[PDB]
RNA sequence: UUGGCGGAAAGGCCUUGGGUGCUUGCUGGCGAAUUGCAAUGUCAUUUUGCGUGGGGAUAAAUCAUUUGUAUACGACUUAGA
RNA sequence: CCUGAAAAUGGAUGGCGCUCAAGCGUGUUACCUAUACUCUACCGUCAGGGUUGAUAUGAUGCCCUGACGAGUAGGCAGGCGUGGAGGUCAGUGACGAAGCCUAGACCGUAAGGUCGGGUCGAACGGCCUCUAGUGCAGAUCUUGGUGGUAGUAGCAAAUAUU
RNA sequence: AUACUGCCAGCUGGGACUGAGGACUGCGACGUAAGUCAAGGAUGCUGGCAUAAUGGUUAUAUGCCGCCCGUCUUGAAACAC
RNA sequence: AAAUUGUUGAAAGGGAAGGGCAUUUGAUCAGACAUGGUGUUUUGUAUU
């Protein structure tokens, strides 16, 4: 439906979002995922940390450089989750993963563009209230990811710039509304209202 | 050789077809297709243009015109399954339509020899189109924005769902 | 206007298949804007075109078209079944097809 | 034919690591090159635009000997002689031209579209 | 182009090649049925090559018909063209490979005079 | 053309001013045909090659020799108008 | 649900992953798809039938109808090829037989047959029958030829050459 | 009244696959009736091309699937020969 | 002749290759059209 769809990963359950995104990529949709450090997994932090440690224990015995490559960044964790749900060993799956992109925070190509959400993957809608959950950035830091502070700093900078932009947008919107209040409620507005718009 | 002489002989007469029982019956058009109805041509060199439906022709075709002075669609025939009926109706009384039919729409197709490696309308056709369009316009102007609508070409916008849309 | 499109967009999802056997004769199409069979019923019988481009010119055009038709509805989610005069090349899984509004019944 | 031969610094010129100096082969090849140059001179060729257009060595009938192995065994000791042939040709510029006509086949709609585009756009 | 017949339908236009004729040079492509006890082709496992069966048989109304609808008839002389003389729409002539050039042009001329179609009116002729 | 802003992968976003085109904000005049009853009916690029006209600067690497902080061979510290 | 609950390469509700589940128990529908079922075409097999026209068709011909089709060991049937033999085509051929090569064409479900092109230089084929030293992927098969290994192991005992 | 169920030789639409057969004969319907028909199997109108366009072969790519044959064996892809 | 090999040309080449169904792309190729027939513009001046 869209050329590229950019998903705010904050507040999303990792498995539900990965299932959705994998289906979209196979259906032919280009997808960018941002704020992967803010993704959620249900269950306690200790529970999911033990899960990642069971993941880490698996490695090719005779050469660890051949074994499973346990990636640590939250974006790479989400990418592994999605690669599990895409048949990545065929050319079709390779093309779908070529369509997928995932980042920590919001890089410059995407902080200036609209970001969407996936309600069937959002923690607030999906998890029963009171259930414990982890944040992918916290888990990644605990398992050895080295850039939580850099990401948070740049996220604060980007949020400051975006809040200034939002204030400017609200100022412009209030000004256009106040100035077109006169041009409103006119004959054309009456016809548009009676004809639906 | 292969064979000396065949004692058993086949027959080369071309068999006559059986007496088929497919007696043609007149077409039943949908209710939305009534004369004087705006139609969006879905295909052709005039795809998306909004014409006026004039008469149901003999060969299951639909006689339409732009009018030519409005959008540039001449007096043509179009297939009824390649248009979309629109709720907009324009009165047809005062317009003569009995003149045109399949024999009016003749072509005298060019030969197979004449290859266009390198490579006009009839005066009667242009004159009767002028008359029919004049009557159509005289009736059309009684409704505001109809001429502008008929000049505007239809299109599918982003977010336009034909299955929910009405025409 | 700058928008001339007279067709609906669709995606060629895959072939008709079970778990481990596909049928290239019948393709599955997701018409973009449809999420239920009751709304997919409008597109039953409509024409579909897969329009691609080849570097070699055949009959005056570098653009080739494979034609087909929507046969029935597939599933609960607005996907439909389509059949083409030539089976879709299977490199076009997730490619764009044009669902025309003809043959029309409106 | 390079499996398990040694490396050298002089393979970098050709992008390889395994290269050698086949003295006997080189002597045979340059003797044949001198023969070909003499033939081209006899035929009246440039000798400076000449380039090795064709060269082909393939296997000849093998010359057989025997070698003696432990526990009273006999094995083959085979030479692998070569038939070598070559052709030197006078170098030439781009000789091939005059591509195909590509006569087109169009339908009525295509013809009408071409006519309309001619009428509208100059 | 000929007598009214159903379209010539080929149920299986692909050649039935022997199993492992691609694997080994000693195994020629001429079809042989696998008689092995564990053979996947004999047991008709999914994904393996098909085996010839009577269900592939062509329609009797179109069997032996050329693409043009005629039936090929190997000929070696004008006497061989004679049996075809009056069945032009059902049979076509095929000049035998070992007819010499002059006799070939003779056969071709007689077939042209008599309206008989030749499937190879181009052998031994300059091209 | 002017003043900025943007380093996370910025390569994009605003902004002063001078020209020119259109404007469907409202009302007009002319053209459309014949692609013949549909045929995607060709209008977006991703690169490359060959030329044209306007600028811009006139290197290194490898072999060979040497070296021995190096080395099975390659590779490697090094030197050499 | 938890404790009870310990085995050796890293690790498997199939995997990813899932927590008012994508878990467990139970109801309701919708949907997906087997070489199964229904209907249709076509092939063959079997069965039941029809058919004596002077005619131009050889009655194991021409037709109508229905039901069937898995298969090792095995049985039977109809056919395809090969060497030689009796008849026949008053058959093909130095104006090119046989043979061979050819991601060229046609035919047959197939065994295979026919043909286009190249090479070649002296014989060969269709049909009706007769005959058999008659069909190969294997037998650590036989004889001959050839590979990868592989420009590889190696060509280093007996003092030594310049 | 509505629901639920059953029935209708009730009505009205949207789709898809198929078109075997090849003079007639049959069973029926239609104001019974000259004749027509949807009644023992697709006809009618129209368009473009007429050529590698459809198709065949071939090589590749893609989706899914596909263990090495022969053999002995209850069982073989077998780390059985 | 084949195994096996050289050259050239064409293709594919992320821990084999080969195969089946299906399409796509490139390459290559066979199959009605003057012909028994519709009636006249008798071309290379019994015949078209």
Curated annotation (Swiss-Prot), chain B:
Pfam families: Ribosomal_L6e. Its main location: cytoplasm. One of its GO terms (biological process) is cytoplasmic translation. GO terms for cellular component: cytosol; cytosolic large ribosomal subunit. It is found in: Cytoplasm. GO terms for molecular function: RNA binding; structural constituent of ribosome. The modification Phosphoserine is found at residue 11. InterPro entries: 60S_ribosomal_eL6, Rib_uL2_dom2, Ribosomal_eL6_CS, Ribosomal_eL6_KOW, Translation_prot_SH3-like_sf. Component of the large ribosomal subunit (LSU). Mature yeast ribosomes consist of a small (40S) and a large (60S) subunit. The 40S small subunit contains 1 molecule of ribosomal RNA (18S rRNA) and 33 different proteins (encoded by 57 genes). The large 60S subunit contains 3 rRNA molecules (25S, 5.8S and 5S rRNA) and 46 different proteins (encoded by 81 genes). This is Large ribosomal subunit protein eL6B. It comes from Saccharomyces cerevisiae (strain ATCC 204508 / S288c) (Baker's yeast). The lineage of its organism: Eukaryota, Fungi, Dikarya, Ascomycota, Saccharomycotina. The gene is RPL6B.
Swiss-Prot record, chain C:
It comes from the Eukaryota. The modification N-acetylalanine is found at residue 1. Keywords: Acetylation, Cytoplasm, Isopeptide bond, Ribonucleoprotein, Ribosomal protein, Ubl conjugation. Component of the large ribosomal subunit (LSU). Mature yeast ribosomes consist of a small (40S) and a large (60S) subunit. The 40S small subunit contains 1 molecule of ribosomal RNA (18S rRNA) and 33 different proteins (encoded by 57 genes). The large 60S subunit contains 3 rRNA molecules (25S, 5.8S and 5S rRNA) and 46 different proteins (encoded by 81 genes). Belongs to the eukaryotic ribosomal protein eL33 family. Its main location: cytoplasm. This is Large ribosomal subunit protein eL33A. The keyword Cytoplasm applies. It comes from Saccharomyces cerevisiae (strain ATCC 204508 / S288c) (Baker's yeast). GO terms for molecular function: structural constituent of ribosome. N-terminally acetylated by acetyltransferase NatA. There is a cross-link at residue 46 (Glycyl lysine isopeptide (Lys-Gly) (interchain with G-Cter in ubiquitin)). It is found in: Cytoplasm. GO terms for biological process: cytoplasmic translation; ribosomal large subunit assembly; ribosomal large subunit biogenesis; rRNA processing. GO terms for cellular component: cytosol; cytosolic large ribosomal subunit. There are 2 genes for eL33 in yeast. The lineage of its organism: Eukaryota, Fungi, Dikarya, Ascomycota, Saccharomycotina.
From Swiss-Prot, chain D:
The modification Phosphothreonine is found at residue 8. Signal peptide: none annotated. It comes from the Eukaryota. Keywords: Cytoplasm, Isopeptide bond, Phosphoprotein, Ribonucleoprotein, Ribosomal protein, Ubl conjugation. Its main location: cytoplasm. It is found in: Cytoplasm. One of its GO terms (biological process) is cleavage in ITS2 between 5.8S rRNA and LSU-rRNA of tricistronic rRNA transcript (SSU-rRNA, 5.8S rRNA, LSU-rRNA). Belongs to the universal ribosomal protein uL22 family. There are 2 genes for uL22 in yeast. Component of the large ribosomal subunit (LSU). Mature yeast ribosomes consist of a small (40S) and a large (60S) subunit. The 40S small subunit contains 1 molecule of ribosomal RNA (18S rRNA) and 33 different proteins (encoded by 57 genes). The large 60S subunit contains 3 rRNA molecules (25S, 5.8S and 5S rRNA) and 46 different proteins (encoded by 81 genes). uL22 is associated with the polypeptide exit tunnel. This is Large ribosomal subunit protein uL22A. It comes from Saccharomyces cerevisiae (strain ATCC 204508 / S288c) (Baker's yeast). The lineage of its organism: Eukaryota, Fungi, Dikarya, Ascomycota, Saccharomycotina. The gene is RPL17A.
From Swiss-Prot, chain E:
SMART domains: Ribosomal_L32e (SM01393). GO terms for molecular function: structural constituent of ribosome. GO terms for cellular component: cytoplasm; cytosol; cytosolic large ribosomal subunit. Disulfide bonds: none annotated. The modification Phosphoserine is found at residue 39. Pfam families: Ribosomal_L32e (PF01655). Keywords: Cytoplasm, Phosphoprotein, Ribonucleoprotein, Ribosomal protein. GO terms for biological process: cytoplasmic translation. It is found in: Cytoplasm. Its main location: cytoplasm. PROSITE patterns: RIBOSOMAL_L32E (PS00580). Belongs to the eukaryotic ribosomal protein eL32 family. PANTHER family: 60S RIBOSOMAL PROTEIN L32 AND DNA-DIRECTED RNA POLYMERASE II, SUBUNIT N (PTHR23413), RIBOSOMAL PROTEIN L32 (PTHR23413:SF1). Component of the ribosome, a large ribonucleoprotein complex responsible for the synthesis of proteins in the cell. The small ribosomal subunit (SSU) binds messenger RNAs (mRNAs) and translates the encoded message by selecting cognate aminoacyl-transfer RNA (tRNA) molecules. The large subunit (LSU) contains the ribosomal catalytic site termed the peptidyl transferase center (PTC), which catalyzes the formation of peptide bonds, thereby polymerizing the amino acids delivered by tRNAs into a polypeptide chain. This is Large ribosomal subunit protein eL32. It comes from Saccharomyces cerevisiae (strain ATCC 204508 / S288c). The gene is RPL32.
